Amino acid sequence: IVGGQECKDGECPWQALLINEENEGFCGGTILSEFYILTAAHCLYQAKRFKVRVGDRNTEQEEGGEAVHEVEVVIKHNRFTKETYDFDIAVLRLKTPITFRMNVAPACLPERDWAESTLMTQKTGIVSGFGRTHEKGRQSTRLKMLEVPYVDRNSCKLSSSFIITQNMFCAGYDTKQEDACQGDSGGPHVTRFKDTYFVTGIVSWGEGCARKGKYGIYTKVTAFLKWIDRSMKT
C-alpha cells in the first residue's frame, strides 16, 4: 500500500497473509469463513509451499492474536490466464478452522445485483495489505489500509496499455500518490454500507504503483459469486 494509513486494532480483521517457506508474506487474502480464504489465481505461482497467517498487524512483534493455518485444497479458476490475468481468482480451504477473535473475522459476501447497483456506485472502497510502500520500496512491516475511489470504466479503459476484461474493475487515483502495490495482490477490496463491510474486489494488477494516469485493477468479485459459492460447498 502506497499512502493511506495503518489498520488500527480490530479495523481490518478479514485480512489474511500468504507466507512462504521462510515465513515471508508474498500475497494477501480475504477471510470468507472459518474454512475459506479468497485470493488471486496469479499468487499461486509465487511459491511452491505456502501457509496462511491471520490476526497479524505488525510482522515484527508477537501481538498474541496471530495464527498460522495449513492449506488442504487450492481451488484456482480454470479459465485463469497469465497473458491477461483474466479470471484472477482462487479459493483456499484450510486444514483447521479459523477461530474468530479480536483482529480475526470474516468479511461478508454480497448478492450480485445489490452489490453492483448499491456498493459499486458508492464513492469509495477500501484496499489493504503488507505490500510494498513504494513502486520499488521494501514491504511494509505494518498492515495498511487505503480508501480508493471507484473509477469510471470508460476512463479506466482509456488509461490502460493492457486489456480490461468484463472480470475486472478499476479504483484509485489519477495523480495522487496512493495505490496498492507489489505484495498486496490477492488481498481485500471491501465496501462499507451502514457499518458493515462486504467483499467487492481482489487486488490483481497495475502498471507500476501509483503512477500518473494509471489506476489499480481488481478482480470483479460480483461476477464470481456463484463460482465462489460452489467452491465453498466443495
Binding site: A105, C108, D195, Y197
Partner: protein, 52 residues
C-alpha cells in the same frame, strides 16, 4: 423509487418484488421482526470490525 430510494430502508440487501421492497441479510444474520434490520445470529458476524 423502492430500492433506489435510500436502499428501501433495508439494513443490507434490497430486492423489488411486484412494486414492493423486500429486504434480506448476509449469511449469519437474521431479518428482524420489522422485516428491515439484520440481527447477528452469533459472535464475530461477518463484516464487523472487532471490539473484543
Amino acid at each position: 423509487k423502492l430500492c433506489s430510494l435510500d436502499n428501501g430502508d433495508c439494513d443490507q440487501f434490497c430486492h423489488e418484488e411486484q412494486n414492493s421492497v423486500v429486504c434480506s441479510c448476509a449469511r449469519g444474520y437474521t431479518l428482524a421482526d420489522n422485516g428491515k434490520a439484520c440481527i447477528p445470529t452469533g459472535p464475530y458476524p461477518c463484516g464487523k470490525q472487532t471490539l473484543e
